[PDB]
DNA sequence: TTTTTTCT
DNA sequence: AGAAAAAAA
């Protein structure tokens, strides 16, 4: 139930989520690779743009993020929109809805240009303000899947370029889509948004850090590299969710 | 239609 | 408010 899941997630903690993010999560590995082949500001802008087109993919998320990172390493990027106009039509893992996705990037381009290194620092210290600002730039609801996901991925990119860690805010929920709906139905009859926010509050682990724990473990990523005590807690969570 | 969105 | 968006079933 909710109490048991919250207890195990609380034992894992932000510390354990941070371990998974930085050591196991393949999307973080892809971002780390790209961060070594392009300037810090362009890197963060590209990560947000990529997140906003990361819906209805033609591939797994891990394949898509690696395709993104390998494509942009060493490239000279000026317009984010023009870069994506060339990138998406040749991609393997993001072939659906390309004109629509390019239009999202053209629309967010101005906001992305405000992401100087200092503004990135400011937003990493106040990710709820970034959450609302991305939504306003697109003219959409901030609860939408790709807006929430862009904040999560911004948090990965910012921590790399700023070499410091700030936890995600408790108020930002897990992104909602057919995938978390299905996982929640495996576990409980409670509605997903209510369920996971309750889990986050009870455990003390913000929802976006819970998001980091869930998907690698559910996808079968190995936990063997976790130190023995954390490994035991991750094994216990696997018993609950998989 | 199924796999998130725009916009009329 | 929900049809259509592109690709894939």
Q: Among residues A29, A85, A142, A177, which one is catalytic?
A: A177
Distance, CA of A127 to CA of A170 (rounded, Å): 10
3-state secondary structure of A47: helix
Residues with Cβ within 8 Å of A13's Cβ and at least 6 positions away in sequence, in order, are A204, A205
For the record, the structure tokens of A238 come out as 């696997």
User: A93 beta carbon < 7 A from strand B?
Assistant: no
Of A197, A186, A201, A229, residue with least CA distance to A15 = A229
What is the experimental method?
X-ray
Distance, CA of A101 to CA of A110 (rounded, Å): 16
Resolution of the entry in angstroms: 1.3
- Write out which nucleotides of chain C lie closer than 7 A to a protein Cβ: 5-8
Question: With contact defined as beta carbons under 8 Å apart, do A43 and A157 qualify?
Answer: yes
Distance, CA of A125 to CA of A144 (rounded, Å): 22
CB neighbour class for A84 (10 Å; exposed up to 12, middle 13-18, buried from 19)? buried
Decide if A39 is catalytic. Answer: no
Residue that the structure tokens 């790709």 belong to: A146
**Interface residues, strand C, Cβ cutoff 7 Å:** A 56, 58, 95-100
Residue that the structure tokens 């317009």 belong to: A79
Residues with Cβ within 8 Å of A160's Cβ and at least 6 positions away in sequence, in order, are A31, A32, A35, A43
Can you give the C-alpha Rg of chain A in angstroms?
A: 17
Distance, CA of A143 to CA of A120 (rounded, Å): 21
Spatial distance from the CA of A78 to the C1' of C5 (Å): 28
3-state secondary structure of A232: helix
Decide if A145 is catalytic. Answer: yes
């Amino acid at each position: 139930g909710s109490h048991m899941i919250a207890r195990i997630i609380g034992e894992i903690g932000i510390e354990g989520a941070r371990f998974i993010e930085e050591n196991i999560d393949e999307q973080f590995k892809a971002l780390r690779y790209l961060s070594k082949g392009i300037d810090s500001e362009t890197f963060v802008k590209l990560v947000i743009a990529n997140s906003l087109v990361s819906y209805q993919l033609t591939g797994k998320g891990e394949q898509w993020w690696w395709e993104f990172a390998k494509y942009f390493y060493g490239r000279d990027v000026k317009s984010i929109y023009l870069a994506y106009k060339e990138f998406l039509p040749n991609s393997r893992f993001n072939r659906r809805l390309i004109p629509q996705k390019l239009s999202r990037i053209r629309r967010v381009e101005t906001f992305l240009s405000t992401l100087t290194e200092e503004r990135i620092e400011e937003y990493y210290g106040d990710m709820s303000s970034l959450w609302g600002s991305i939504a306003r730039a697109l003219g959409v609801d901030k609860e939408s899947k790709t807006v929430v996901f862009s904040v999560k991925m911004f948090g990965y990119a910012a921590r790399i370029v700023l070499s410091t860690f700030n936890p995600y805010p408790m108020e930002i929920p897990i992104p909602e889509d057919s995938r978390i709906v299905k996982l929640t139905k495996k576990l409980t009859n409670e509605k997903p948004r209510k369920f996971w926010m309750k889990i986050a509050r009870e455990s003390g682990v913000p929802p976006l850090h819970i998001d980091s724990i869930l998907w690698p473990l559910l996808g079968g990523a190995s936990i063997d590299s976790a130190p023995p005590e954390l490994r035991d807690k991750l094994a216990e969570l696997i018993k609950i969710i998989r």
